[PDB]
Amino acid sequence: IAHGDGRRPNKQRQYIVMKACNKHHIGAEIELAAADIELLFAEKETPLD
Amino acid sequence: IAHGDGRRPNKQRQYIVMKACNKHHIGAEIELAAADIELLFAEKETPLD
């Protein structure tokens, strides 16, 4: 404000504002037992399997 | 939920629930009089029968 009084008038002003980001994390979990994965590779030897 | 707090994650789950049936009994009790049962098989030869 340019006001005509005895209050000490001030020049131009300028601010510098400076951010920063964050990091976040997710961790899941899976049920796999090797008795399942064992029979993933053998096949055909009976119509049961 | 997979969440990134400081925590041991959990395997998935699976539930097995058993049910049954319920036995019931219902009993009705007809009486029949003997003089009825005789002339049910009557010869039917009169105009009073």
Minimum Cα–Cα distance from A26: chain B residue: B4
Write the CB contacts of B49 (distance below 8 Å, at least 6 apart in sequence): B39, B42
Minimum Cα–Cα distance from A33: chain B residue: B11
Amino acid identity, residue A3?
H
Q: How far is B28 from chain A (nearest CA, A)?
A: 52
Residues belonging to chain B: 49
> How far is the CA of B49 from the CAs of A30, B35, B36, B39, in angstroms?
87, 14, 12, 9
The reported resolution of this PDB entry, expressed in Å, is: 4.2
Experimental method: cryo-EM
